[PDB]
Structures are given as structure tokens and as C-alpha cells.
Design a protein around this nucleic acid. Structure first.
Lengths: 134, 51, 187, 93, 52
RNA sequence: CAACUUUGGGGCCGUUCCUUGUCUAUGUUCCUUGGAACAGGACGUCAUAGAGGGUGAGAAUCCCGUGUGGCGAGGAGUGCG
RNA sequence: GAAAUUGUUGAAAGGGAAGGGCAUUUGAUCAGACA
RNA sequence: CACGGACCAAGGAGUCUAACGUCUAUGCGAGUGUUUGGGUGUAAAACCCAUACGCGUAAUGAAAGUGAACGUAGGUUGGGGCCUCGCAAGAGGUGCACAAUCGACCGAUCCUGAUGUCUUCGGAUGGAUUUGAGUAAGAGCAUAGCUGUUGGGACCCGAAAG
């Protein structure tokens, strides 16, 4: 149904190649979810505000999970205290990355996530708010 | 740290001086972005033609 | 969708494309250079006054106006006829009802008079480099309306309620005065 | 309803700034030390007009640290949240 | 100085050099890491023996 | 009523502008082909000149030019030295 | 120096169409390969 | 049926533009947009840039106006992933997007009418429905591509003209 992205980005193609291998040969559903998410068009990869990451990390038993955002993580000045955590994202805005590091966290790419968490262990995939138009 | 780049004199010999590699040489190499920006910018010197 | 397209009015006879933008920019720079050569030591522009912009949207901003008022020039220590010949702009129709702007302009004129040399008319003039711009030399400075950090002076009365009482007294001034006149004629 | 002859958009200019975005107005370099100090003396002064807003609104929550907020207009609840934080609203002349 | 670095901001006002979305270009070194090689299942085999 | 400050007009020579003239690098060396070398090869030279055009076929180095500088001539000018 | 169109030469077909499809006869012509 | 076709060459008909959209790629992202203009230049290129402005971040009402947190930004149900035990089967927990419903918030509508007050001003507090591409930890701005609509000669030629 969908195998290749429409992006001509070389590095996005490398990420798709990497997680294609992982989702072929790991049987962990995280990698399949991420690979499915890599092909999404830009309207279907809404940005995930950094305050949404904090809200996800505020849940029960989710304080130390490594958040994964298959898309762009954006700043949110509406949040003042932000927790120290690890965030794997396709892209970070300068404000979002600066806030994550300022709280003591870390902004890692998706392949660094693949090295650290190859079967997607102890992760938390966030999807941004979707409704843009009709 | 950042790997050093040797500096050659006017006769081609490599002097002892070497320099850190600037951070723009670690920038992502995106042929698609270069392609689209070139193909737009390469239109900016054109002159109008008409009958 | 609802969208208006005004292109039925023989518009093709009046389509202006700005292919000359780069050529006009080069010609403009050439004109600036040649005018600077013509006026050789003088700057390209005239000393413009400091002005507070008109409307509620822009009265927060201070802008470079047209020319110094007669009051500003006299308070600076020179006549308007002479001021116009030392590169100072004089505006006869601008009025002064603001001491801050008046003093700011007088201070601009005081600084301007000292930062320039005026060559003697007779001859043997001293050498002076041409400075092209006087607006870059004497930029318009935004006044600082308050210091960075202050004490919290709580009066106790709400700000919103102050605005609503202001709007109310604006609303009912006329009928209140009418009732006052009626009670006055009724003693 | 009515029909409004000769609209001038100068006198109906009134941008809104909610309370959540209020602390963005303080420069980013000094913001963290203003959060850390939290003092009723030397509280920071925000002139929203100079920043280009007309009315302050009460959407977000602001940190419980005082701040002197200067604006042309504030909503009732914006007033309440600013005062309840130890700050105050001074109407801009 | 012209294009900035992680130490000097830039001569271009508000410019920061682009950020990689993949840490390393070589994907085969990633796939042949100890962690990936641990996670995956046995290889399979590429060219299939024709049955029937 | 009271004290201070300011000042024209020209002529000469330059400069500026305009319009013009002239001058200002380096192979036509060897070999083959061809009607013709401006082609191929070898060895060079000039380059702030490898834009362009001509010349018997794709010529920086043959010619005019180009590039860069010099020398003038006639004016306009009071802009100013 | 194309095609339409024409002359001559050589080959061929033609009992009120010509052309086209598949297959093969016949005539003319023609490419490729070394345990 | 009717219409076109004696033959050959060459020409010959969905183009460009503007304003809106849809989708996708790209850049940055509560921002975004250098290119009106200025600076610079190897000169219509490229490079650089202040102020402003546009759109977006706030809606609603005819308007004056007013203006988005009771709560872990909400309760239940469902929900990709993940976490715990388990060889596994499953058991539980957490639950993104989203969807359904019930609540909360902002404006509008109808009431009630406190603290007080130029005695008519103020709107406190608490209810009733409906209601909006409304809030409920932003998603936009710009560019490009394939394109849809509409207006221009508008796929090309041709109608009775004024």
C-alpha cells in the first residue's frame, strides 16, 4: 500500500532504509509503527510541541521513557518547568532543542534511537494534534 | 576535535600550519535542496522576450 | 469560493512589469554618488527633527519628521533662515504642544551645531571629509518610558474597574449634566 | 445591523496578548533570572504597547512571580491573574 | 565566522547552520552495530531454492 | 530703546564634465594533412588582454580590437583647488 | 537538394480494382563463427 | 444518412497571467516571509540588511463591548505503541492521534440582582436553553511542483453586427 516516501531527502531515505530493515527483522511493533510514520506527508506529521512532551512524561509510570516524535518537535513558551528526558525526533526547532537541553535532557536523532533502542524498548510515540482544516 | 586541514604554500609544499575544519563543512549535503534552489536561482538573470 | 477578479477592463494595455528594478537601483546609486560629488563636503540629507507619530496605532513610536519648528530653532540659538543654510530642515507649519519633543529637538539641534564645521565663506577652507548621512550620524532614539525593574506599587483599586468607571463616566456625562441643570433650575 | 461609513483601521487597532505568552515579552536572556529572583521590589516592567499590543487577555497561567504589566487594556481575569501573582497592572498613558 | 559554528554565532543575523536528521551517513555501520545485531532475528537467506 | 555679527565683483592657471584624436602585450617557429591551417602534434610567449570580429576550415599569440595606462585637441563651467 | 509528380533502364504482376492479415512456394538480395 | 478527404512539403490548435483553493516536496516553526527599498558587486546575477507591513498565534456580538484552567487542561468508553508478570496463551498499567458522550471556559441570549454608590451608576453572586470550523500544552508563514475554479483573446478557426 505504501513503501516509499515522496520526499527526495537523502537522509530521510536512509532513515526509511534503516527502519525498513528493523521492521523486517525484529517483529517488535514499534519499528513497524515508526516506518509507517516515516512515509507520512507533511500535513499528516503535525508538529509536537515540547509542552506536549512534558505532558506525556507526566503520566503514571512514564517519567523515564524516551519519547519518540516521528516529525518535528516545536518550542512552547507556555511551559516554564520542563522535565529532563531523552527525545528522539526527526527535527527539532532551535527553541525546542534549546529548552530540552536547558532542562538537562538530550535531543537525539531517530538512528541514534535505533542504536540505543533497536526494538523500541521503553519508548513513547507521540503524534501531534491533527485537525488543520476540513 | 575537529580534524586539521594542512595549508600549502605557493610552491605547493605543505607548511606546518594546519587549520580546524569549519563547521559549514559538516552541514548536511542535500542534493535535492541544492537542485531546487539552483533551478530557481538560475532563472534570476533572465531577460524578457515577447513577440 | 467567493473571489473577485478585476481583469476584464482592457487591463492588458496597462500591465507594468518592473524589469528596470536593478537598472533603476544602479541609476539611483549613481545619482546619489554624483550629487554627493556636487555638494562635495555636505551630507546628502538634511537634519530631520524628532517627532511622535500621529494615531493611537503609532503614537507609541517616534519618527523622523519633516523639519524643526521655529520655536525649536530659536531655542537652539539660531535663526530659521540661517538654519536652512547649514543643512537644518525648518518646518513653519509644525506646532509645539509637547515639551518632551521640543526639548528632544532642541537637543538634536545643539548636538548638530557642535558636530559640524561650517567653512568660512571668504575662502581658505579647512579640509573636511564628507560624511554622507546625517540620519546615520544622529539617529532617532526611542525614549525609554520606564526603568527596567521597579517596585510593585499596588494602589488596591482594580485596573479593569478603573477602565470601566472611565467608560461609564464617558457614557453618562451628558445626561448627568442634564439632570444637574434640571436640579439647578429646580434649586 | 449597521453600515459603518468611512472605516479607519487606525483607531480600531488593538492586538491581544494572552497571559501565557506574556513572559515571552521579557528578553530571553533576562527571563530566567527574573523567574529565579521573584521579588516585589525590582519586579520586571513590561510595556506591552512598546511591544505592540493593545489589550492583555487572561488565557494561560503565569508563574507565581510578580511582574509590573503596563498595557492600554486588560481583561478582568487578566487583572486577577496578574495581581494574584503579586504583580500589578499600570494603565499606559 | 561567515557561516557560524557551535562556538561563534554567525555574521548572518539569526542564522544557525542546518541540523542533521540522521546522525551518521553510513547506515551499514548502524545496522551492523552490536545492539542491532543483538535485536534482530537470524538472517534468512536471499536467493530461494526452487521447490516444485 | 541696545549692543554685536556678516558682505561684492572680476581676470589667469588647474580640477570636473562633455565631445573627440593618438599611443599602449605575446609564434605567423618545426612536422603531417588539406585547394586554404585558422586542423592534429611539438616547443614556446603574453595575459589588468582567453569579449568579439576578420583573414582561404575551431586563431589569445596574423590583423583590428579587448584589457590597462599615457599623451593630447576643442568646448561647457563657475561647481571648486 | 526531400516528398508529391515525371523520363529512361532492370525485374515482376495483370481475364471488370488496388491495398491490407497469417502462412509458405519461387526468384532476387543479404547479416553472422570457430571443440 | 449527412459532412471532410486529388496528391506532397512546411506551418497548424488547453497557452500565459492574476486571485483563491486541494494535494505533495522544501525551509523555518508561534512564528514566518532577504529581493518596496538600502548596502555591496566580478553588475539586470550573487551576497548582506534596518524599519515597517502581510498572514498566523483569539473568539464572539447587529453593536457598545466582553474575551477563553474548579480539576494532574477533565470524567467515562474505545484506541496504535510502550511498561510489568508470563516459554506462550493471556492478565494488568499507561495510554499519542482520533472518535462518542457527559462536564468546565469565552462571547452572544434570558433571568437573579450582593460590596457599594454623583441615586442612578456598578455587576457581584448564582441559574436557563440554544449557540460559534471558539478555548481545553498552539500550526502556521513562505517557496516550488502536479493541478481545480473564476476573469482575461483563454484550445484553434468560423454567426446574423453596433
Amino acid at each position: 500500500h505504501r513503501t516509499a516516501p515522496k520526499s527526495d531527502n537523502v537522509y530521510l531515505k536512509l532513515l526509511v532504509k534503516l527502519y525498513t530493515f528493523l521492521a523486517r527483522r525484529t517483529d517488535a511493533p514499534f519499528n513497524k509503527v515508526v516506518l509507517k510514520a516515516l512515509f507520512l506527508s507533511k500535513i499528516n506529521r503535525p508538529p509536537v510541541s515540547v509542552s506536549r512532551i512534558a505532558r506525556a512524561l507526566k503520566q503514571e509510570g512514564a517519567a523515564n521513557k524516551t519519547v519518540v516524535v516521528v516529525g518535528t518537535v516545536t518550542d512552547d513558551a507556555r511551559i516554564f518547568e520542563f522535565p529532563k528526558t531523552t527525545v528522539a525526533a526527526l527535527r527539532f526547532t532551535a527553541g525546542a532543542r534549546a529548552k530540552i537541553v536547558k532542562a538537562g535532557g538530550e535531543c537525539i536523532t531517530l538512528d541514534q534511537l535505533a542504536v540505543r533502542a533497536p526494538k523500541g524498548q521503553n519508548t513513547l510515540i507521540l503524534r501531534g494534534p491533527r485537525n488543520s482544516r476540513e | 576535535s575537529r580534524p586539521q586541514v594542512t595549508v600549502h604554500s605557493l610552491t605547493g609544499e605543505a607548511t606546518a600550519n594546519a587549520l580546524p575544519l569549519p563547521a559549514v563543512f559538516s552541514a548536511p549535503i542535500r542534493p535535492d535542496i541544492v537542485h531546487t534552489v539552483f533551478t530557481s536561482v538560475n532563472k534570476n538573470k533572465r531577460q524578457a522576450y515577447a513577440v | 469560493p467567493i473571489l473577485k477578479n478585476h481583469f476584464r477592463k482592457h487591463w492588458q494595455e496597462r500591465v507594468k512589469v518592473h524589469f528596470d528594478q536593478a537598472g533603476k537601483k544602479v541609476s539611483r546609486r549613481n545619482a546619489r554618488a554624483t550629487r554627493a560629488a556636487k555638494i562635495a563636503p555636505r551630507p546628502l540629507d538634511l537634519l530631520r527633527p524628532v517627532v511622535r507619530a500621529p494615531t493611537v496605532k503609532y503614537n507609541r513610536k517616534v519618527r523622523a519628521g519633516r523639519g524643526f519648528t521655529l520655536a525649536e530653532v530659536k531655542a537652539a540659538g539660531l535663526t530659521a533662515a540661517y538654519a536652512r543654510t547649514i543643512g537644518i530642515a525648518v518646518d513653519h507649519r509644525r506646532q509645539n504642544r509637547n515639551q518632551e519633543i521640543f526639548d528632544a529637538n532642541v537637543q538634536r539641534l545643539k548636538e548638530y551645531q557642535s558636530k559640524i564645521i561650517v567653512f568660512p565663506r571668504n575662502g581658505k577652507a579647512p579640509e573636511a571629509e564628507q560624511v554622507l548621512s546625517a540620519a546615520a550620524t544622529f539617529p532617532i532614539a526611542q525614549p525609554a518610558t520606564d526603568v527596567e525593574a521597579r517596585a510593585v506599587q499596588d494602589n488596591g483599586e482594580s485596573a479593569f474597574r478603573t477602565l470601566r468607571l472611565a467608560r461609564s463616566e464617558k457614557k453618562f456625562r451628558g445626561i448627568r449634566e442634564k439632570r444637574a441643570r434640571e436640579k439647578a433650575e429646580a434649586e | 445591523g449597521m453600515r459603518y461609513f468611512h472605516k479607519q483601521q487606525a483607531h480600531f487597532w488593538k492586538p491581544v496578548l494572552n497571559l501565557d505568552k506574556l513572559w515571552t515579552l521579557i528578553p530571553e536572556d533576562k527571563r530566567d533570572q527574573y523567574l529565579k529572583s521573584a521579588s516585589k521590589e525590582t519586579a520586571p516592567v513590561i510595556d506591552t504597547l512598546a511591544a505592540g499590543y493593545g489589550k492583555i487577555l487572561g488565557k494561560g497561567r503565569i508563574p507565581n512571580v510578580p511582574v509590573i504589566v503596563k498595557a492600554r487594556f486588560v481583561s478582568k481575569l487578566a487583572e486577577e491573574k496578574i495581581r494574584a501573582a503579586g504583580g500589578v497592572v499600570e494603565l499606559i498613558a | 565566522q561567515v557561516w557560524g559554528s557551535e562556538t561563534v554565532a554567525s555574521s548572518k543575523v539569526g542564522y544557525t547552520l542546518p541540523s542533521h536528521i540522521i546522525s551518521t551517513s553510513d547506515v551499514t555501520r548502524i545496522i551492523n552495530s552490536s545492539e542491532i545485531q543483538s535485536a534482530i532475528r537470524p538472517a534468512g537467506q536471499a536467493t530461494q531454492k526452487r521447490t516444485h
